[PDB]
Amino acid sequence: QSACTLQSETHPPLTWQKCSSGGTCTQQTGSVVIDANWRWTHATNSSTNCYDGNTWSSTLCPDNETCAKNCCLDGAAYASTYGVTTSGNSLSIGFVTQSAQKNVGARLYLMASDTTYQEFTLLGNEFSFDVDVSQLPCGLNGALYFVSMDADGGVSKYPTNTAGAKYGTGYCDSQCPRDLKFINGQANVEGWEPSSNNANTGIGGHGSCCSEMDIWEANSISEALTPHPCTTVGQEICEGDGCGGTYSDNRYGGTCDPDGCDWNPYRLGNTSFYGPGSSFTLDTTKKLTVVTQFETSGAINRYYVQNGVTFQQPNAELGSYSGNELNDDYCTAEEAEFGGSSFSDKGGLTQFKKATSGGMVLVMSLWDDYYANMLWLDSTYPTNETSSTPGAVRGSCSTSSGVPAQVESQSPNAKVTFSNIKFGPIGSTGNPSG
Numbered sequence: 001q002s003a004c005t006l007q008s009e010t011h012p013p014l015t016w017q018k019c020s021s022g023g024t025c026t027q028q029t030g031s032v033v034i035d036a037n038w039r040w041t042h043a044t045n046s047s048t049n050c051y052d053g054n055t056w057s058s059t060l061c062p063d064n065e066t067c068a069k070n071c072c073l074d075g076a077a078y079a080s081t082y083g084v085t086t087s088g089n090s091l092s093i094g095f096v097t098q099s100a101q102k103n104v105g106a107r108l109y110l111m112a113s114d115t116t117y118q119e120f121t122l123l124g125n126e127f128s129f130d131v132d133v134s135q136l137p138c139g140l141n142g143a144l145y146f147v148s149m150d151a152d153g154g155v156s157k158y159p160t161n162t163a164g165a166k167y168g169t170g171y172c173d174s175q176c177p178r179d180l181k182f183i184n185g186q187a188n189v190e191g192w193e194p195s196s197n198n199a200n201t202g203i204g205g206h207g208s209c210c211s212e213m214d215i216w217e218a219n220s221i222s223e224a225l226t227p228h229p230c231t232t233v234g235q236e237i238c239e240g241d242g243c244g245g246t247y248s249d250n251r252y253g254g255t256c257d258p259d260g261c262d263w264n265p266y267r268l269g270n271t272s273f274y275g276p277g278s279s280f281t282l283d284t285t286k287k288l289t290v291v292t293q294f295e296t297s298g299a300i301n302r303y304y305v306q307n308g309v310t311f312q313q314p315n316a317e318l319g320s321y322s323g324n325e326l327n328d329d330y331c332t333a334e335e336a337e338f339g340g341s342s343f344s345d346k347g348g349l350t351q352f353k354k355a356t357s358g359g360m361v362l363v364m365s366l367w368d369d370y371y372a373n374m375l376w377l378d379s380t381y382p383t384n385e386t387s388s389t390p391g392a393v394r395g396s397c398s399t400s401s402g403v404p405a406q407v408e409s410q411s412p413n414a415k416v417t418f419s420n421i422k423f424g425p426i427g428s429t430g431n432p433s434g
């Protein structure tokens with residue numbers, strides 16, 4: 001797709017800290033851009049929609065190539081339309097924003113310039129951030145993660161995409177998303193099936209796959225750390241059901257691992273670590289600092305800080321595994337006790353190491369789940385299982401919670417605030433900010 005200018009595009013500024021092994025940190029100035037799927041896609045010479053509701057214009061978009069030629073992505077009114085605001089090192093994302101139309105959530109990427117994404121090499125480094133999840137109830141996910149996207153949004157590889165990173169193109173994750181309206185400079189109108197429960201989305205004949213590092217997927221009730229490997233490290237298109245993921249009828253038939261090796265303290269047995277109020281180790285009604293370290297072995301370490309008190313990831317005992325480090329032994333023990341073969345089939349942490357050794361783009365989002373009501377994160381999943389089934393209970397939310405239309409109606413003012421992002425060598429982000 002191309003870019004249009006009927007609505008101006010001004011990326012909300014966001015500062016972060018780059019720290020060094022020497023003990024000091026320096027401020028970096030970047031910005032955030034909303035993903036192409038949330039934007040208004042219209043004709044290049046008029047204001048006629050190429051996509052409206054969950055359907056494509058059959059005349060402007062008869063096939064994927066002609067659609068990309070006749071259509072363009074326009075600018076976003078971040079605050080008034082999408083409920084996205086920034087202030088210094090802080091980013092706030094509202095749940096439901098009412099303007100001329102209703103908008104639900106947003107998916108944002110950190111930029112290096114107004115036309116390029118910021119790339120981070122996670123291996124050997126650590127990522128720290130502050131988060132306020134107090135206004136996030138059951139069914140919502142305030143996510144901070146990394147994906148192996150191209151810095152230009154895919155422009156150099158696919159010239160029919162001239163919109164690029166400036167307009168949030170080139171997204172991919174481990175679910176190999178088929179809901180994307182534009183993949184590889186072409187539309188996704190061919191094979192498009194409108195969502196039966198979402199008036200704004202659908203599923204197309206193409207999907208976009210790549211490695212995904214879920215540093216943070218959470219709400220006020222539950223939180224999870226999940227690395228997801230793929231046989232092909234970076235962005236790659238997939239065909240129909242051969243994609244795998246949430247959008248396909250078989251989630252394990254593709255090139256990526258849609259499950260991942262998840263570490264959820266509640267799911268592993270510590271139901272007293274994370275929750276609302278002083279009855280938990282980490283009080284989710286207050287701001288908390290989350291630090292994630294990627295040592296060169298490929299293992300992931302984690303610690304938290306709240307009110308000056310430091311807590312390492314809680315120890316978990318699963319099978320022959322014992323400890324608090326997310327390593328190969330944890331992931332193998334998880335598959336043995338909770339079930340599944342997806343993580344190991346795709347290569348485990350050894351394959352995932354190829355992703356963290358390369359560049360990855362920072363993604364910050366807020367969304368509800370139209371496929372599984374976020375039950376996989378904060379409730380009992382599958383719903384017919386009990387606590388007697390290993391790893392079934394992931395949180396205290398009811399198996400009846402998270403219905404999109406209901407949470408959108410009941411908690412429209414829900415929000416997540418990500419702040420004070422610090423990045424640098426392991427053991428360096430706890431030093432003074434510059």
Ligand SMILES: CC(C)NC[C@H](O)COc1cccc2ccccc12
Pocket residue numbers: 143145173174175212214217228246258259365369371372376
């Ligand atoms: C932030 C988001 C892109 N991360 C999603 C992770 O890939 C995990 O995905 C998922 C894992 C298990 C079930 C699911 C159901 C619906 C949607 C996603 C699911």
Ligand SMILES: *[C@@H]1O[C@H](CO)[C@@H](O)[C@H](O)[C@H]1NC(C)=O
Pocket residue numbers: 269270271272273281311312313314315
């Ligand atoms: C949960 O983890 C915290 C922090 O490590 C610890 O203090 C607490 O004792 C743990 N509780 C249980 C029941 O494991």
Ligand SMILES: *[C@@H]1O[C@H](CO)[C@@H](O)[C@H](O)[C@H]1NC(C)=O
Pocket residue numbers: 382384385386
């Ligand atoms: C839950 O339902 C699934 C699908 O019917 C089934 O495979 C599984 O055995 C059920 N579990 C229980 C505890 O009934």
Ligand SMILES: [Co+2]
Pocket residue numbers: 206239
């Ligand atoms: Co094709």
Ligand SMILES: [Co+2]
Pocket residue numbers: 295297299325
């Ligand atoms: Co280690």
